[PDB]
Assembly symmetry: D3
């Protein structure tokens, strides 16, 4: 009979991805302005190169200065022969600098449980001192259909990402784009077109599932790194719906993610003014008052606190 | 089973006018309004130190004022507070039979409603209350919307379910301090042009689906900007389109707007009756489908037209 | 488990042409159409008094007409009617093996499909029918959408699921008499100007997710205004974008429109093949990600490309 | 927030079965002392005779005087080609004297829902004035595993029987007997054998499921009609666990079922004395007191009423 | 991925019940050898005396020296008008000496949740320093049918009792006795009768539900307080199945319960010998060995520890 | 649906002979026994310090020894231990194709099995293993029996489920240090005389029901007192009566006992065939029920008789 479980307090404004098969770029990633680093063994690495990428990543975890980055590795999916070797090698060979693993293409709670079972055993066997957190990608029809059970699937779970590329493919969406506006998704009214959000339910359901269970909801990749305004629009929708951050799949997207997912000065100012107004009303024996011609009440305090919390971390 | 979905309560619910229990001067004004439902508030419009006085005010008003034919409801405090049980005990022990309903806020699962039901049922039996209260709830949290159907099925007392956009936004972590309505940062970019979309679509549609499945009235909640009448119309129109049957007024100005939108227009009713006539005429010719104004109407159109008619003849 | 989602039926389902069984004159025209699937109707396009005769007409048509390579389906009456059992018994006892499929309307739970499955299975065994029927259902009620996934997993016979916007709107209590498409009162107001949004988004997306999870074909239902080609294109395009693989035609003119929208454009197919080419080249360079026209493409892009190509090459 | 829903108040001490293919038995069954009559289309009727059995039963429903007896027909199972014809013909051809149908081999709630769907449609189409009630047999591993959902499967459902023959076969029990003691089910203690109840859970779980949902739990066939004392033991176990009656598969078993499932005057006497004792205790301001060296309290009232209710039936 | 959650470590060998309407007995109860005291507001107290009993109990909680007894109160059920008054008065008026509340006739998890909602609110409102634990009674068809969900229903939940009197009534069992042997529940073999356990499933299922979720399973009242040997048999059965204690409804039953539910010196000796034997085997590089002509292995260690654990508390 | 329960594996499973992997001298003796299934143990018969060596021994034994036609299984360590993952990896990366099965102990939910399935499936694919392993599990905890049905349905690989009375007793908190069999303190008192009852009844029956529902073989576990032949026979006889198809042998002597009890006697088979013959004759007379030795036999009796004959003809 308390409120929502609090999610992890750590910053998660941007998760910068890089293929494990390009170790020369690891230093640049560590030096970036991204909160989270995702070294990839999955869909940015060709099958013949996954063994080498695995070796590269283990070496980088043990050898590089990762500063204050939250260090995550995306392993291969449970429908592949690679996943078990990813987990075993990482947990048997990588030092304690590794923070987290990301599980792709999650379709049910049991998927997460399976990884948890293996990871827990190796951590115990090898006497690992820093237990890994988990993050997952909802990027299939099964994933979104079972989104709440997945959100509740492990005490290790800290974050859940939408993967619009795999999601579109799994859903059979007629597009080769990764996130963003869809040309053929619009409303016709009086001869004019009005574009609508083809991702609404997927993103909102993920947010609801995450907040219910104390997980961070995160927006995934936006493919068009040549389109800053397009990225801003996608990030803005996500931030509005309750997602706390977004992937960067290109160095330029890091600043854009940090821009959108850090509340503006004006937003923070209004938030504090609402808090001040409600405190004043409280002293007058009132639980509701008027702010700029609109209603504010006790619920507004919680809303204002959402803004301030994201700005103060 | 093997019948159509359960019919919801047939009472009017176009507008629910809210007022803080700590401002008893508003009570007679609320009683005089054109609102179908009255919600005397003990929760989020009332500061903590004023909750006891508000409870006393409300009980006295339930017993003392002429409430006409309005459906009288009280929003109690949430189950995550120390206030809720005293709200329920005092109301059920001291309020007369003019009280019709209580509103449970921040409902996260069916068991929340069951808990209030258990308490209310016991006191009604102990006091020999002749008019059993109905319940209404607010879906205004991540847990709430995630568990929306089980909540809709949670009690025989349950008559209505409202979306609470303010608490919903806070719960979901939505980057906004507004209450319902258009969100500036929720738009589609297309060829340099912005196209605003509905950031509340799923939540509202899911509430409607859960309610209609289990014979509950789906209702839209507060719209914060009482200076923005067209914004209210837009929000109310979206809700009415999705299947919600009414909307809160948190200011007297909003009652007229709610009644305007949630009462089907003459034009809409006229078309509905024309469609009903068209289908009856088609039925006589041995047809279950026909053409009306260049479009298809069939047996399903009868049910749709009856949705328009029903809300108008109430 | 530990495989990709089950593959849906490989058959074309770009358009399902509907016609009332009480109008046998339409039958040969439907057989001559360009529709992938034919739906002979016993339900909401047929008046109650004509349903018995419509049943007889349809049985004659199944046994007598040249249906070519059309997938032949019959929409029976709902389980909340006295007609449904006579539809199924007569069809399965009297129709020959040309019948491919039965469509069940107004499905609200998995048990509805199980019930029809139980009866159909018994008759097929009793009469030694050589070609067991496939099933398709309509999600067209609040209960249907609330229980969409369990319905999608309800039978090994199930091949397709349609959204029925007319009955869905009526069931949801949506204030409209239109069938699908833009709703005048569903828009966002931003700085004094309106921006229309999709009032069907969740229902459509949830149906697609349910279907793709369980190897079913998600299909868009009727668009009422057969006088509005561009409106049809808009609706069909939204559906195609979300992952639905076809759309009903309730008028001959809509068949060409459906085939057009649900067959990927040459431009779209061209880009897909270019992406596939780019990704193979990247593989050879020891890369699982590369750049295509200023955009990221990776291993997932291969799957997206294959969605386009697969649908174009059928 | 009330007590468990009340089951049907009609007597169900004994259900007398007879094959539909042996219509000479019908008038004898109608003249018996059995509360319920079950005319059989299923496992007592060979496949080639089922169509004629169906015709015989319809004739008997419409032509015989069944007095005050509750008239039921056991149809064929949902895994057979026969069931649909059974239901269609019964509801389209039989008059309103038919009270009930028994569905065999029920494995899940959806099985009962399927029959309900068909039955409801025909009753509406033909304007039948007396809607049928349902009863089912739990006689498979799936049946007992899903016993509660089956008990809640239909507002038509009035009774649930255990079918020990099919249950044994389904469970793979090493026996060819029908109910009763099993020679190989005993406890060995210091060289002595003590026979135990191999049907305990199945019977108890059926009672629990039924009472939870307002259904009558009933014991099924006892095969050895040459063994009166064996029948008595089986019937007594069932009555003790809470089952309200038992099948008769031979005329001799009817009197035995009525004997066991009608509470003895001794039992009724004790119950009334306990009831009187509790009333006297309440007058003294006591909720508990002593009866024959035993504790009795407010719970004892409910127990005594269980006895009396079945006696005044 | 650990062992099942440990139940509360406190002793619970005997729960001595007494009606709240007889406060003259409270001192005798406090001085008894019972681990837990249950002051009753329910079925041992007549309806008209429930108000006075409530006041009596609140006074006794605040006034009596309860030593080290675990102090619990059985409130009225959720299907009565009394329950809310019991809870409100107890939590608003009784001091911090109260340890626990017993909820009778529980039929689902939501029942426990309902009481938890009320209790939690009052504790917060009144600033109660010691949060109450909960215990419940499984004593209805719905209760046993939903026994696992009930066991998982609240973090407060510490114990679950079988209530054989209400259970028998709810199930429609033909008896007026409370627990123990049932005359009509026996197996007939070669003209000889062999009595079996009519309570087996109910008791075993309660134990399983409790041990799964870290709850103590407890046996309920035995009615015939004139029958020491009958009590011993009932207690021995419960102890064998895994119940950790039993109600006393008469002073004489306290010593009996303590006798049976404290492992005998012989039993403890064998346990320690098995532990010693297994330690010796481990030193020889063995995980299994022979003890008194039988197999003992790693599992035997856990079994021996069950014995020792109960003896050492 | 609409078919009888799924058939379990047809292979013999009358006895599963266990032996610790840390005693390789036993291996050839086990291979020469009359047991249908062999269980090489890495778990509770092997001390923690000896588990690595046991693993090496067993892998070498799988590849090196002639196991004839016996079904070869290995019991791995539990998912609550650090050993289990190394057990599975080494077995699947190093053992040849002679390995048939692995046994998972202390299973508490379906997800436990799914977890092992996930790991096993990946290694089989990575190594191109030609014969996919089957799974068997042990129900030997409170959670295990509480969730027995979901566990039985947890994997397509699952072929058998055993009751583990030692761990079950410990988990349930049973006051005993014995393994299976009569419990001295579990009896009914009646008129001064004691009558011992089955303290394992529900656990065994529920396991049988879960298995038969989902086409799994239910098996009885270890009986600890190998000095007590009649105790074993009694325990095995109870299990065979409830529907379990075999039993563990934890000592060579027990193999003969298990085969004795779990092979139907000639008397039992003769009666079964006589009943089948009687029912055949009844069918010819136009009867579905008749009399056999003063008792009723009908169509259900045919299935019962077939249960006896089937176990005899393995
Ligand atoms: C999109 C991508 C393929 C483009 O690669 P590219 O053609 O070499 O990119 P650019 O030329 O525009 O890179 C600009 C600079 O940033 C570096 N850079 C490229 N990708 C980087 C990354 N992911 N992280 C950090 N630095 C990166 C480049 O090496 C180059 O450095 P320089 O200035 O010293 O020359 C590349 O950014 C990439 O691999 N993306 C991440 C893919 C991934 O991990 N996807 C996850 C699944 S969606
Ligand atoms: C109980 C146990 C420790 C007794 O060992 P023991 O003292 O050597 O047994 P015995 O001396 O009576 O054995 C008799 C003979 O059978 C052999 N034997 C013992 N256990 C055997 C087994 N499990 N399989 C095959 N042969 C076995 C012995 O080697 C000996 O053979 P021999 O005549 O050539 O000398 C041993 O049987 C054992 O480990 N059992 C299996 C334990 C197990 O796997 N349990 C896990 C599941 S609960
Ligand atoms: O994982 C991804 O990059 C995706 O599918 O969106
Ligand atoms: O209940 C409310 O006012 C809200 O939070 O929207
Ligand atoms: O089935 C239909 O035509 C509908 O309701 O949309
Ligand atoms: O139905 C029956 O007779 C049975 O199988 O017990
Ligand atoms: O609570 C009790 O005493 C009972 O019903 O057994
Ligand atoms: O696994 C075992 O041997 C047991 O616990 O019975
Ligand atoms: Mg992906
Ligand atoms: Mg609110
Ligand atoms: Mg329709
Ligand atoms: Mg049978
Ligand atoms: Mg009781
Ligand atoms: Mg074990």
């Amino acid at each position: 009979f308390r409120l929502q479980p609090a999610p992890p307090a750590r910053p998660n404004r941007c998760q910068l991805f890089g293929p494990g098969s390009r170790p020369a770029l690891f230093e640049k990633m560590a030096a970036s302005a991204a909160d989270v680093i995702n070294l990839d063994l999955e869909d940015s690495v060709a099958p013949d190169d996954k063994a080498q990428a695995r070796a590269n990543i283990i070496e980088a975890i043990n050898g590089l200065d990762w500063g204050r980055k939250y260090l995550s590795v995306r392993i291969n999916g449970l429908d592949t022969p690679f996943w078990y070797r990813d987990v075993v090698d990482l947990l048997e060979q990588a030092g304690d600098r590794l923070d987290q693993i990301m599980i792709p293409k999650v379709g049910c709670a049991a998927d997460v449980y399976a990884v948890d079972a293996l990871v827990t055993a190796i951590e115990r066997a090898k006497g690992r001192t820093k237990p890994l957190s988990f993050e997952v990608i909802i990027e299939s029809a099964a994933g979104i259909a079972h989104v709440e059970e997945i959100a509740a699937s492990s005490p290790r779970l800290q974050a859940m990402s939408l993967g619009a590329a795999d999601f579109a493919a799994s859903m059979g969406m007629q597009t080769t784009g990764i996130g963003g506006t869809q040309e053929n998704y619009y409303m016709l009214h009086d001869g004019q077109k009005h574009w609508s959000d083809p991702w609404h339910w997927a993103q909102a359901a993920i947010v609801a599932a995450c907040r219910t269970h104390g997980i961070l909801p995160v927006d995934g990749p936006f493919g068009d790194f040549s389109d800053d305004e397009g990225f801003r629009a996608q990030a803005r929708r996500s931030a509005t719906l309750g997602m706390v951050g977004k992937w960067a799949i290109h160095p330029k997207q890091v600043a854009l993610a940090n821009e959108v997912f850090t509340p503006s000065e004006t937003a923070v100012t209004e938030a504090r003014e609402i808090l001040a107004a409600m405190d004043a009303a409280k002293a007058r024996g009132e639980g509701a008052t008027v702010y700029k011609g609109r209603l504010v009440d006790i619920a507004s305090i919680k809303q204002a606190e959402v803004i301030v919390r994201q700005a103060e971390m």
